[PDB]
Design a protein around this ligand. Structure first.
Ligand SMILES: Nc1ncnc2c1ncn2[C@@H]1O[C@H](COP(=O)(O)O)[C@@H](O)[C@H]1O
Ligand SMILES: [Mn+2]
Lengths: 213, 214
């Protein structure tokens, strides 16, 4: 089948988290990874990664550092979220000078010309729908407008294969991709989600937008 | 100091929750509590509480029942969110007939009216800004329009005392208010949040609106 988007940008945020009985409502991004997937060659053409220095809870709990694999010295070495969106936009602008990529709000037909369509792919509506949305509203930051529509890969998986997977790891195993060990985080989790997305593309899945704000 | 609002309605929603890493599910309100605080006498003149039956994930996780203290028999005995918003509006309408309450930021006529102004008070912008907002848009429910502006008591606390509190429990402790038992949730967290507001009122804090959505 012919794909609608010529590129996919896969994002899997890591955030502050605790397991200690207390009542936490807000979470802060601590890692911003993204991989540019080529939906016709299956290769990763570019990558972005930044460590976000949390402001509201600057000290990572032991549970968080164990779960995400991020060490305190890395978020201490990182930039605040506002500077992180700036670097992410410069990266988005760089792959546009290189790949001639545009973000369109409602595509009905694939490109037949020199332009290349692109969309963001997440494993859930949590990254761009809850995490970055509430934090941008809470910190009153200017959120890039192209991050308001994305592809929920989990919903796409549930409908293309007609089965509920046991997480992102369970999804990879059910299609023959067997990986063992600790749960991957950050950029490594983004690469694995892109590996899943590319496998679904080869199986005949047409990636379409699932959420709009 | 003279207060702007004669009554405050304090809300502390409880919702389904999990703590298991990159496994994010949708969350649904499971308790809708509210206490009517009298900002001149410091007393609670009325209370509202309802247990909400979650539809997308009806079975409370062990982590959720541990954190909130809410048992499964209570949410199975409760009503869905749509019916709960209906009951909450009936309560708001009852306390307006009773207390002569309107929800308005200011009276423009000179004081020829015994009418009483009211505002909603929550700990952080999460209750009415994230919890009830995102769930109403996802379930395509009609959210009461008076729930679009509220007082963020934590922001009011950070500015009135010039210190960052470690949650509602940490905030109450710094002013001497010590409670025993498990971390309060739902109606008990609503009563204690109203106690904090009354402490701030007695210390001379004028409660103002902090967040608006309309
Ligand atoms: N540590 C936490 N992890 C995940 N969710 C939480 C945590 N603490 C509180 N919540 C959620 O926040 C809601 C409100 O709790 P409270 O802050 O006590 O009013 C709870 O019902 C949970 O859904
Ligand atoms: Mn709360």
């Amino acid at each position: 089948s012919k794909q609608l988007f010529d590129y996919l940008i896969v994002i899997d945020f890591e955030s502050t988290c605790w397991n200690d009985g207390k009542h936490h409502h807000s979470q802060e991004i601590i890692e911003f990874p993204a991989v540019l997937l080529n939906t016709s060659t299956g290769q990763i053409d570019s990558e972005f990664q930044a460590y976000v220095q949390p402001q509201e809870h600057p000290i990572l709990s032991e549970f968080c550092m164990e779960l995400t694999g991020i060490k305190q010295a890395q978020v201490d070495e990182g930039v605040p979220l506002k500077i992180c969106l700036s670097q992410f936009c410069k990266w988005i602008h760089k792959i546009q000078q290189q790949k001639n990529i545009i973000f369109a709000t409602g595509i009905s037909e694939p490109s037949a010309s020199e332009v290349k369509l692109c969309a963001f792919v997440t494993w859930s509506d949590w990254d761009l729908g809850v995490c970055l949305e509430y934090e941008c509203k809470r910190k009153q930051l200017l959120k890039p407008v192209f991050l308001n529509s994305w592809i929920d890969l989990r919903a796409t998986y549930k409908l293309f294969y007609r089965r509920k997977p046991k997480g992102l790891s369970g999804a990879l195993q059910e299609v023959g991709i067997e990986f063992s060990g600790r749960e991957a985080s950050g950029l490594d989790a983004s690469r694995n989600t892109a590996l899943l997305a590319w496998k679904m593309i080869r199986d005949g899945c047409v990636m379409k937008i699932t959420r709009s704000l």
